[PDB]
Amino acid sequence: PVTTSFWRIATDARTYEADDLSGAGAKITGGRWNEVGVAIVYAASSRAMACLETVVHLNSGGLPLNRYLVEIEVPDEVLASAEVATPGNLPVGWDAEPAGRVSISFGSQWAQSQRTALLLVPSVIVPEETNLLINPAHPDAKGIKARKVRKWLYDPRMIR
Amino acid sequence: VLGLAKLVGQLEDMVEESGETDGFDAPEWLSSWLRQPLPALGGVNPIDLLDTMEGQAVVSRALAQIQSGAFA
């Protein structure tokens, strides 16, 4: 392949879809690495990690949501240009729970500087493994594609 | 003031937009969620934060992120 896949477990909403690459959802709510009003796409380096970040970390099991596994195909030359943040080089406090100013500010500086289109960050759940942030405003984000590949059905609170 | 009705409404709107409302008991689901550790908030039960306006905002944001897909 000349692409590398990252993963979301996402829903359709009223004004954006599960395969959105505009960062509409995170723009509305904010997140660990972005302010309300700043659009960013959050994806995980494995499908397992997407489940931990999306379902387990927010304890959202048991909701009758129509969740989709979304594959985000990132051009390898764009990934090669990504910034890599690690627990070792991030500012102290990036892993605060609830997320606070350190990670949000770091993410904001990265987004507004447009240093790179992609930022790889550690997960607060498993710091050794990574999530991907995509800045849709960055010129280099051109060529990234997203598609629903199947329903996501694994729900630890599912009743048989 | 807990303002559970506002959180229930938020949850009902989310399921209406993003899932299936038929058969879904939102106050029942919210009751359990509020009383279970929320890893995104460091393992605290969301109900314990509803005594301040700041805590209310934090819990509402976490609930909203269930739909938005921002990592918390």
Concatenating the DSSP letter of every residue in chain A gives --EEEEEEEEE--SSS-TT--S-HHHHHH-BTTB-TT---EEEESSHHHHHIIIIITTT-TT--B-EEEEEEEEEHHHHTT-EE--TTTSPTTTT-SS--HHHHHHHHHHHHHTS-SEEEEE-SSSTTSEEEEE-TTSGGGTT-EEEEEEE----TT---
Å from B1 to nearest chain A CA?
A: 22
Domain count, chain B: 1
C-alpha to C-alpha distance for A86 and A29, rounded to whole angstroms? 25
- Judge contact between A59 and B38, C-beta under 8 A: yes
Nearest residue, CB atoms, A64 vs list B20, B64, B65 = B20
* Enclosing domain of residue B61: 1-72
Distance, in Å, from the CA atom of B39 to the CA atom of B59, rounded to the nearest integer, reads 12
- What lies within 8 Å, CB to CB, of A12 at 6+ separation is A18, A66, A68, B17, B18
Residue of A nearest to B61 (CA): A29
Q: Is B43 left (phi over 0), alpha (psi -120 to 50) or beta?
A: left
Q: How was this structure determined?
A: X-ray
Q: Are A28 and B58 within 8 A, CB to CB?
A: no
Cis peptide bond N-terminal to A98, omega within 30 = yes
Residues of chain A with C-beta less than 8 angstroms from the C-beta of B14? 63, 65
Is residue A142 within 8 A of residue A115, CB to CB? The reply is no
CB < 8 Å to A11, chain B: 18-19, 67, 69
Cα A126 to Cα A3, A78, A156, B18, distances in angstroms:
24, 25, 19, 28
Resolution in A: 1.5
d(Cα B38, Cα B50) in Å, to the nearest integer?
14
